PDB file of C-alpha atoms and ligand atoms in Angstrom:
ATOM      1  CA  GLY Z  10     267.052 -37.247 320.435  1.00  0.00           C
ATOM      2  CA  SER Z  11     263.933 -39.389 320.107  1.00  0.00           C
ATOM      3  CA  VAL Z  12     263.225 -42.400 317.945  1.00  0.00           C
ATOM      4  CA  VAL Z  13     260.935 -41.305 315.106  1.00  0.00           C
ATOM      5  CA  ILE Z  14     258.488 -43.248 312.959  1.00  0.00           C
ATOM      6  CA  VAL Z  15     259.557 -42.589 309.359  1.00  0.00           C
ATOM      7  CA  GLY Z  16     257.482 -45.171 307.523  1.00  0.00           C
ATOM      8  CA  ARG Z  17     255.713 -48.500 307.802  1.00  0.00           C
ATOM      9  CA  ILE Z  18     255.543 -51.969 306.310  1.00  0.00           C
ATOM     10  CA  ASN Z  19     251.971 -52.612 305.151  1.00  0.00           C
ATOM     11  CA  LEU Z  20     250.886 -56.217 305.656  1.00  0.00           C
ATOM     12  CA  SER Z  21     247.184 -55.834 304.867  1.00  0.00           C
ATOM     13  CA  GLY Z  22     247.258 -57.332 301.380  1.00  0.00           C
ATOM     14  CA  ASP Z  23     248.698 -60.560 300.038  1.00  0.00           C
ATOM     15  CA  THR Z  24     251.793 -58.546 299.119  1.00  0.00           C
ATOM     16  CA  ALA Z  25     253.742 -56.533 301.683  1.00  0.00           C
ATOM     17  CA  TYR Z  26     254.994 -53.069 300.811  1.00  0.00           C
ATOM     18  CA  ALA Z  27     256.977 -50.272 302.437  1.00  0.00           C
ATOM     19  CA  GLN Z  28     255.613 -46.741 302.771  1.00  0.00           C
ATOM     20  CA  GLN Z  29     257.847 -43.779 303.627  1.00  0.00           C
ATOM     21  CA  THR Z  30     256.154 -41.083 305.736  1.00  0.00           C
ATOM     22  CA  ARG Z  31     259.149 -38.866 306.548  1.00  0.00           C
ATOM     23  CA  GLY Z  32     262.364 -37.862 304.847  1.00  0.00           C
ATOM     24  CA  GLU Z  33     265.838 -37.326 306.294  1.00  0.00           C
ATOM     25  CA  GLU Z  34     265.414 -33.733 307.454  1.00  0.00           C
ATOM     26  CA  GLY Z  35     261.941 -34.334 308.853  1.00  0.00           C
ATOM     27  CA  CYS Z  36     263.304 -37.300 310.776  1.00  0.00           C
ATOM     28  CA  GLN Z  37     266.103 -35.221 312.293  1.00  0.00           C
ATOM     29  CA  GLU Z  38     263.828 -32.307 313.208  1.00  0.00           C
ATOM     30  CA  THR Z  39     261.234 -34.591 314.788  1.00  0.00           C
ATOM     31  CA  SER Z  40     263.925 -36.474 316.709  1.00  0.00           C
ATOM     32  CA  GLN Z  41     265.127 -33.230 318.286  1.00  0.00           C
ATOM     33  CA  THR Z  42     261.727 -31.984 319.445  1.00  0.00           C
ATOM     34  CA  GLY Z  43     260.164 -35.362 320.121  1.00  0.00           C
ATOM     35  CA  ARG Z  44     256.884 -33.991 318.762  1.00  0.00           C
ATOM     36  CA  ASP Z  45     255.227 -36.205 316.140  1.00  0.00           C
ATOM     37  CA  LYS Z  46     251.643 -35.579 315.033  1.00  0.00           C
ATOM     38  CA  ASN Z  47     251.627 -37.842 311.960  1.00  0.00           C
ATOM     39  CA  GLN Z  48     248.834 -40.407 311.752  1.00  0.00           C
ATOM     40  CA  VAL Z  49     250.003 -43.871 312.764  1.00  0.00           C
ATOM     41  CA  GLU Z  50     248.641 -47.078 311.291  1.00  0.00           C
ATOM     42  CA  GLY Z  51     249.509 -50.737 310.928  1.00  0.00           C
ATOM     43  CA  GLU Z  52     251.632 -53.164 312.921  1.00  0.00           C
ATOM     44  CA  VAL Z  53     255.179 -52.691 311.648  1.00  0.00           C
ATOM     45  CA  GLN Z  54     256.767 -49.247 311.769  1.00  0.00           C
ATOM     46  CA  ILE Z  55     259.990 -48.129 310.147  1.00  0.00           C
ATOM     47  CA  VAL Z  56     261.802 -46.087 312.770  1.00  0.00           C
ATOM     48  CA  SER Z  57     264.949 -44.011 312.834  1.00  0.00           C
ATOM     49  CA  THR Z  58     267.255 -41.939 314.968  1.00  0.00           C
ATOM     50  CA  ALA Z  59     269.702 -39.400 313.557  1.00  0.00           C
ATOM     51  CA  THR Z  60     272.167 -42.196 312.823  1.00  0.00           C
ATOM     52  CA  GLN Z  61     270.327 -45.531 312.764  1.00  0.00           C
ATOM     53  CA  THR Z  62     267.247 -46.913 311.019  1.00  0.00           C
ATOM     54  CA  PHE Z  63     265.447 -50.144 311.884  1.00  0.00           C
ATOM     55  CA  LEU Z  64     261.979 -51.554 312.570  1.00  0.00           C
ATOM     56  CA  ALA Z  65     259.433 -51.555 315.393  1.00  0.00           C
ATOM     57  CA  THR Z  66     256.488 -53.930 315.845  1.00  0.00           C
ATOM     58  CA  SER Z  67     253.315 -53.567 317.922  1.00  0.00           C
ATOM     59  CA  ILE Z  68     252.398 -56.702 319.875  1.00  0.00           C
ATOM     60  CA  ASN Z  69     250.251 -56.807 323.011  1.00  0.00           C
ATOM     61  CA  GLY Z  70     249.565 -53.079 322.800  1.00  0.00           C
ATOM     62  CA  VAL Z  71     253.277 -52.297 323.000  1.00  0.00           C
ATOM     63  CA  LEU Z  72     255.539 -50.978 320.254  1.00  0.00           C
ATOM     64  CA  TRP Z  73     258.632 -53.181 320.549  1.00  0.00           C
ATOM     65  CA  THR Z  74     262.064 -52.782 319.027  1.00  0.00           C
ATOM     66  CA  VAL Z  75     265.708 -53.640 319.704  1.00  0.00           C
ATOM     67  CA  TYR Z  76     267.890 -51.880 322.258  1.00  0.00           C
ATOM     68  CA  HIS Z  77     270.851 -51.885 319.877  1.00  0.00           C
ATOM     69  CA  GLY Z  78     268.712 -49.689 317.671  1.00  0.00           C
ATOM     70  CA  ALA Z  79     266.812 -47.448 320.068  1.00  0.00           C
ATOM     71  CA  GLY Z  80     269.112 -47.353 323.074  1.00  0.00           C
ATOM     72  CA  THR Z  81     267.103 -45.976 326.000  1.00  0.00           C
ATOM     73  CA  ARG Z  82     265.655 -43.185 323.863  1.00  0.00           C
ATOM     74  CA  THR Z  83     262.185 -41.697 324.050  1.00  0.00           C
ATOM     75  CA  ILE Z  84     259.866 -42.011 321.072  1.00  0.00           C
ATOM     76  CA  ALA Z  85     258.370 -38.919 319.453  1.00  0.00           C
ATOM     77  CA  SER Z  86     254.600 -38.709 319.940  1.00  0.00           C
ATOM     78  CA  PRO Z  87     251.661 -36.282 319.617  1.00  0.00           C
ATOM     79  CA  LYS Z  88     252.350 -35.173 323.193  1.00  0.00           C
ATOM     80  CA  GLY Z  89     256.134 -34.890 323.011  1.00  0.00           C
ATOM     81  CA  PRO Z  90     258.859 -37.446 323.845  1.00  0.00           C
ATOM     82  CA  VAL Z  91     257.655 -40.560 325.656  1.00  0.00           C
ATOM     83  CA  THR Z  92     259.896 -42.678 327.871  1.00  0.00           C
ATOM     84  CA  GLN Z  93     260.278 -46.411 327.346  1.00  0.00           C
ATOM     85  CA  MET Z  94     257.826 -48.550 329.278  1.00  0.00           C
ATOM     86  CA  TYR Z  95     260.034 -51.622 328.940  1.00  0.00           C
ATOM     87  CA  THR Z  96     263.805 -51.868 328.841  1.00  0.00           C
ATOM     88  CA  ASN Z  97     265.802 -55.087 328.918  1.00  0.00           C
ATOM     89  CA  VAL Z  98     269.182 -54.322 327.411  1.00  0.00           C
ATOM     90  CA  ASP Z  99     270.485 -57.863 327.796  1.00  0.00           C
ATOM     91  CA  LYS Z 100     267.577 -59.351 325.849  1.00  0.00           C
ATOM     92  CA  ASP Z 101     268.119 -56.452 323.429  1.00  0.00           C
ATOM     93  CA  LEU Z 102     264.457 -55.505 323.887  1.00  0.00           C
ATOM     94  CA  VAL Z 103     262.716 -52.194 324.495  1.00  0.00           C
ATOM     95  CA  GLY Z 104     259.104 -51.085 324.245  1.00  0.00           C
ATOM     96  CA  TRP Z 105     256.810 -48.062 324.385  1.00  0.00           C
ATOM     97  CA  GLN Z 106     253.038 -47.994 324.811  1.00  0.00           C
ATOM     98  CA  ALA Z 107     251.781 -48.457 321.253  1.00  0.00           C
ATOM     99  CA  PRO Z 108     250.845 -45.188 319.476  1.00  0.00           C
ATOM    100  CA  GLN Z 109     247.167 -44.422 318.997  1.00  0.00           C
ATOM    101  CA  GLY Z 110     246.264 -45.649 315.529  1.00  0.00           C
ATOM    102  CA  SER Z 111     248.534 -48.687 315.588  1.00  0.00           C
ATOM    103  CA  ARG Z 112     247.329 -52.279 315.455  1.00  0.00           C
ATOM    104  CA  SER Z 113     249.080 -55.157 317.228  1.00  0.00           C
ATOM    105  CA  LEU Z 114     249.900 -58.489 315.626  1.00  0.00           C
ATOM    106  CA  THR Z 115     248.297 -61.382 317.517  1.00  0.00           C
ATOM    107  CA  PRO Z 116     250.795 -63.760 319.174  1.00  0.00           C
ATOM    108  CA  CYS Z 117     250.967 -67.058 317.294  1.00  0.00           C
ATOM    109  CA  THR Z 118     249.069 -70.035 318.719  1.00  0.00           C
ATOM    110  CA  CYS Z 119     249.799 -72.288 315.725  1.00  0.00           C
ATOM    111  CA  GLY Z 120     253.062 -73.815 316.902  1.00  0.00           C
ATOM    112  CA  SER Z 121     253.864 -73.694 313.187  1.00  0.00           C
ATOM    113  CA  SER Z 122     257.524 -74.023 312.222  1.00  0.00           C
ATOM    114  CA  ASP Z 123     256.990 -72.332 308.860  1.00  0.00           C
ATOM    115  CA  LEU Z 124     257.895 -68.712 309.553  1.00  0.00           C
ATOM    116  CA  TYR Z 125     258.220 -65.543 307.501  1.00  0.00           C
ATOM    117  CA  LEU Z 126     260.609 -62.697 308.240  1.00  0.00           C
ATOM    118  CA  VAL Z 127     259.376 -59.236 307.305  1.00  0.00           C
ATOM    119  CA  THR Z 128     262.200 -56.874 306.352  1.00  0.00           C
ATOM    120  CA  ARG Z 129     262.316 -53.093 306.068  1.00  0.00           C
ATOM    121  CA  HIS Z 130     262.365 -53.569 302.281  1.00  0.00           C
ATOM    122  CA  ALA Z 131     259.057 -55.464 302.493  1.00  0.00           C
ATOM    123  CA  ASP Z 132     260.744 -58.701 301.438  1.00  0.00           C
ATOM    124  CA  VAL Z 133     258.930 -61.497 303.300  1.00  0.00           C
ATOM    125  CA  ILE Z 134     261.531 -64.245 303.609  1.00  0.00           C
ATOM    126  CA  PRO Z 135     260.698 -67.909 304.277  1.00  0.00           C
ATOM    127  CA  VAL Z 136     262.248 -69.195 307.509  1.00  0.00           C
ATOM    128  CA  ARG Z 137     262.199 -72.661 309.083  1.00  0.00           C
ATOM    129  CA  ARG Z 138     261.993 -72.466 312.864  1.00  0.00           C
ATOM    130  CA  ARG Z 139     264.647 -74.574 314.597  1.00  0.00           C
ATOM    131  CA  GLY Z 140     264.322 -73.575 318.245  1.00  0.00           C
ATOM    132  CA  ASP Z 141     262.604 -71.090 320.552  1.00  0.00           C
ATOM    133  CA  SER Z 142     264.706 -68.196 319.265  1.00  0.00           C
ATOM    134  CA  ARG Z 143     266.201 -69.407 315.988  1.00  0.00           C
ATOM    135  CA  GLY Z 144     265.166 -70.235 312.442  1.00  0.00           C
ATOM    136  CA  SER Z 145     266.990 -70.952 309.174  1.00  0.00           C
ATOM    137  CA  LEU Z 146     266.726 -68.768 306.072  1.00  0.00           C
ATOM    138  CA  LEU Z 147     265.202 -70.769 303.219  1.00  0.00           C
ATOM    139  CA  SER Z 148     266.341 -68.250 300.599  1.00  0.00           C
ATOM    140  CA  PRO Z 149     269.907 -66.885 300.560  1.00  0.00           C
ATOM    141  CA  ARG Z 150     270.555 -63.284 301.649  1.00  0.00           C
ATOM    142  CA  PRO Z 151     273.664 -61.230 302.485  1.00  0.00           C
ATOM    143  CA  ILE Z 152     273.986 -59.730 305.946  1.00  0.00           C
ATOM    144  CA  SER Z 153     273.911 -56.326 304.225  1.00  0.00           C
ATOM    145  CA  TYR Z 154     270.387 -56.850 302.851  1.00  0.00           C
ATOM    146  CA  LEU Z 155     269.005 -57.754 306.283  1.00  0.00           C
ATOM    147  CA  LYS Z 156     270.636 -54.792 308.034  1.00  0.00           C
ATOM    148  CA  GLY Z 157     268.041 -52.279 309.170  1.00  0.00           C
ATOM    149  CA  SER Z 158     265.442 -54.998 309.693  1.00  0.00           C
ATOM    150  CA  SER Z 159     265.979 -55.723 313.390  1.00  0.00           C
ATOM    151  CA  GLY Z 160     262.723 -55.102 315.233  1.00  0.00           C
ATOM    152  CA  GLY Z 161     260.689 -56.634 312.432  1.00  0.00           C
ATOM    153  CA  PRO Z 162     258.329 -59.601 313.030  1.00  0.00           C
ATOM    154  CA  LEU Z 163     258.639 -63.287 312.251  1.00  0.00           C
ATOM    155  CA  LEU Z 164     255.141 -64.323 311.134  1.00  0.00           C
ATOM    156  CA  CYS Z 165     253.535 -67.755 310.937  1.00  0.00           C
ATOM    157  CA  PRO Z 166     251.474 -68.811 307.888  1.00  0.00           C
ATOM    158  CA  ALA Z 167     248.396 -67.244 309.501  1.00  0.00           C
ATOM    159  CA  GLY Z 168     250.030 -63.848 309.959  1.00  0.00           C
ATOM    160  CA  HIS Z 169     250.441 -64.203 313.718  1.00  0.00           C
ATOM    161  CA  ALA Z 170     253.523 -62.883 315.511  1.00  0.00           C
ATOM    162  CA  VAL Z 171     256.074 -65.552 316.403  1.00  0.00           C
ATOM    163  CA  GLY Z 172     258.963 -63.293 317.317  1.00  0.00           C
ATOM    164  CA  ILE Z 173     261.020 -60.136 316.821  1.00  0.00           C
ATOM    165  CA  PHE Z 174     264.125 -60.204 314.593  1.00  0.00           C
ATOM    166  CA  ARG Z 175     267.146 -59.536 316.813  1.00  0.00           C
ATOM    167  CA  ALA Z 176     270.329 -60.699 315.081  1.00  0.00           C
ATOM    168  CA  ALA Z 177     271.496 -62.579 312.003  1.00  0.00           C
ATOM    169  CA  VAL Z 178     273.436 -65.827 312.165  1.00  0.00           C
ATOM    170  CA  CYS Z 179     276.439 -65.155 309.934  1.00  0.00           C
ATOM    171  CA  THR Z 180     278.204 -68.211 308.568  1.00  0.00           C
ATOM    172  CA  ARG Z 181     281.034 -67.835 306.057  1.00  0.00           C
ATOM    173  CA  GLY Z 182     280.121 -64.214 305.512  1.00  0.00           C
ATOM    174  CA  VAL Z 183     276.430 -64.580 304.636  1.00  0.00           C
ATOM    175  CA  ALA Z 184     273.141 -64.800 306.530  1.00  0.00           C
ATOM    176  CA  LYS Z 185     272.349 -68.438 307.315  1.00  0.00           C
ATOM    177  CA  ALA Z 186     269.760 -68.076 310.059  1.00  0.00           C
ATOM    178  CA  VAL Z 187     268.034 -65.533 312.271  1.00  0.00           C
ATOM    179  CA  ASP Z 188     268.032 -65.089 316.039  1.00  0.00           C
ATOM    180  CA  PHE Z 189     264.768 -63.634 317.341  1.00  0.00           C
ATOM    181  CA  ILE Z 190     263.025 -62.711 320.570  1.00  0.00           C
ATOM    182  CA  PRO Z 191     260.070 -65.094 321.053  1.00  0.00           C
ATOM    183  CA  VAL Z 192     256.655 -63.467 321.423  1.00  0.00           C
ATOM    184  CA  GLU Z 193     256.284 -65.380 324.683  1.00  0.00           C
ATOM    185  CA  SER Z 194     258.884 -62.986 326.114  1.00  0.00           C
ATOM    186  CA  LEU Z 195     256.924 -59.865 325.190  1.00  0.00           C
ATOM    187  CA  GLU Z 196     255.021 -59.880 328.485  1.00  0.00           C
ATOM    188  CA  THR Z 197     253.254 -56.711 329.630  1.00  0.00           C
TER     189      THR Z 197
HETATM  190  C1  2R8 R   5     271.760 -58.241 309.561  1.00  0.00           C
HETATM  191  C2  2R8 R   5     270.960 -57.852 310.564  1.00  0.00           C
HETATM  192  C3  2R8 R   5     270.674 -57.932 312.040  1.00  0.00           C
HETATM  193  C4  2R8 R   5     269.289 -57.829 312.576  1.00  0.00           C
HETATM  194  C5  2R8 R   5     270.251 -56.738 312.834  1.00  0.00           C
HETATM  195  N1  2R8 R   5     270.827 -57.046 314.094  1.00  0.00           N
HETATM  196  C6  2R8 R   5     272.177 -56.841 314.267  1.00  0.00           C
HETATM  197  O1  2R8 R   5     272.910 -56.285 313.448  1.00  0.00           O
HETATM  198  C7  2R8 R   5     272.752 -57.360 315.584  1.00  0.00           C
HETATM  199  C8  2R8 R   5     273.165 -56.247 316.532  1.00  0.00           C
HETATM  200  C9  2R8 R   5     274.214 -56.868 317.457  1.00  0.00           C
HETATM  201  O2  2R8 R   5     273.626 -57.944 318.151  1.00  0.00           O
HETATM  202  C10 2R8 R   5     273.162 -57.670 319.417  1.00  0.00           C
HETATM  203  N2  2R8 R   5     273.286 -56.398 319.961  1.00  0.00           N
HETATM  204  C11 2R8 R   5     272.951 -56.036 321.264  1.00  0.00           C
HETATM  205  C12 2R8 R   5     272.417 -57.074 322.117  1.00  0.00           C
HETATM  206  C13 2R8 R   5     272.235 -58.420 321.613  1.00  0.00           C
HETATM  207  C14 2R8 R   5     271.706 -59.491 322.418  1.00  0.00           C
HETATM  208  C15 2R8 R   5     271.567 -60.830 321.850  1.00  0.00           C
HETATM  209  O3  2R8 R   5     271.088 -61.908 322.570  1.00  0.00           O
HETATM  210  C16 2R8 R   5     270.606 -61.659 323.891  1.00  0.00           C
HETATM  211  C17 2R8 R   5     271.936 -61.148 320.473  1.00  0.00           C
HETATM  212  C18 2R8 R   5     272.463 -60.106 319.633  1.00  0.00           C
HETATM  213  C19 2R8 R   5     272.620 -58.767 320.183  1.00  0.00           C
HETATM  214  C20 2R8 R   5     275.068 -57.531 316.366  1.00  0.00           C
HETATM  215  N3  2R8 R   5     274.013 -58.117 315.487  1.00  0.00           N
HETATM  216  C21 2R8 R   5     274.016 -59.205 314.684  1.00  0.00           C
HETATM  217  O4  2R8 R   5     273.040 -59.543 314.019  1.00  0.00           O
HETATM  218  C22 2R8 R   5     275.299 -60.024 314.648  1.00  0.00           C
HETATM  219  N4  2R8 R   5     274.985 -61.426 314.840  1.00  0.00           N
HETATM  220  C23 2R8 R   5     275.071 -61.976 316.071  1.00  0.00           C
HETATM  221  O5  2R8 R   5     275.473 -61.389 317.029  1.00  0.00           O
HETATM  222  O6  2R8 R   5     274.638 -63.233 316.083  1.00  0.00           O
HETATM  223  C24 2R8 R   5     274.530 -64.034 317.261  1.00  0.00           C
HETATM  224  C25 2R8 R   5     273.513 -63.435 318.234  1.00  0.00           C
HETATM  225  C26 2R8 R   5     273.975 -65.399 316.799  1.00  0.00           C
HETATM  226  C27 2R8 R   5     275.927 -64.200 317.913  1.00  0.00           C
HETATM  227  C28 2R8 R   5     276.052 -59.863 313.308  1.00  0.00           C
HETATM  228  C29 2R8 R   5     275.266 -60.505 312.148  1.00  0.00           C
HETATM  229  C30 2R8 R   5     276.293 -58.346 313.064  1.00  0.00           C
HETATM  230  C31 2R8 R   5     277.391 -60.617 313.425  1.00  0.00           C
HETATM  231  C32 2R8 R   5     270.055 -55.340 312.345  1.00  0.00           C
HETATM  232  O7  2R8 R   5     269.515 -55.178 311.257  1.00  0.00           O
HETATM  233  N5  2R8 R   5     270.467 -54.334 313.107  1.00  0.00           N
HETATM  234  S1  2R8 R   5     270.174 -52.881 312.480  1.00  0.00           S
HETATM  235  O8  2R8 R   5     271.065 -52.676 311.379  1.00  0.00           O
HETATM  236  O9  2R8 R   5     268.793 -52.605 312.341  1.00  0.00           O
HETATM  237  C33 2R8 R   5     270.703 -51.724 313.631  1.00  0.00           C
HETATM  238  C34 2R8 R   5     269.749 -51.269 314.673  1.00  0.00           C
HETATM  239  C35 2R8 R   5     270.388 -50.302 313.731  1.00  0.00           C
HETATM  240 ZN1   ZN R   6     250.332 -68.982 314.223  1.00  0.00          ZN
END
């Protein structure tokens, strides 16, 4: 089946919030047909297959997410299932042409090390960047709370895209840091 948009994380106001646009059955039906006519908007989508839910983020006109979420699946669209335009399984990165109605986050030109991770729960978590693909959590979270948030953006103070959340750094059974795909690698 296809990956289906089932919600979004709205980042337009000073406070992020999640919006659900499809329920469980609708998700499963839409995955099977690959036909999705729902209006798209915003930069961060909540996406789901029959068995996994995670995030997708539009940057550079491409809707990006993680391979360990989407596999090589098509995404449901107004015209039926659409094949991936980008697939790098080793980087854990896939992408489709962004849906009409979506907006892309602008890649960060700040070089800021003060980052913010956007989760599927709309928790925007402070993160200190340490390297090209790593930053430390500045507020404690369990691995379990971050699960389902892969594919979500790391933002800089200005709301620019710094990276895509790929994996959590687990130390002594809790989330200590995040591993992310740098926006510089999201080349079209
Ligand atoms: C808590 C949340 C994290 C963000 C989240 N990602 C994970 O669960 C990821 C998935 C898997 O990693 C990787 N797979 C494939 C290729 C990879 C290529 C890489 O690089 C090219 C690096 C990692 C890779 C294991 N993993 C970890 O994060 C693991 N961490 C990990 O591997 O950390 C390293 C990378 C520092 C070793 C962990 C924490 C399970 C032990 C998530 O929410 N997923 S999800 O639930 O949405 C789900 C799609 C449905
Ligand atoms: Zn910036």
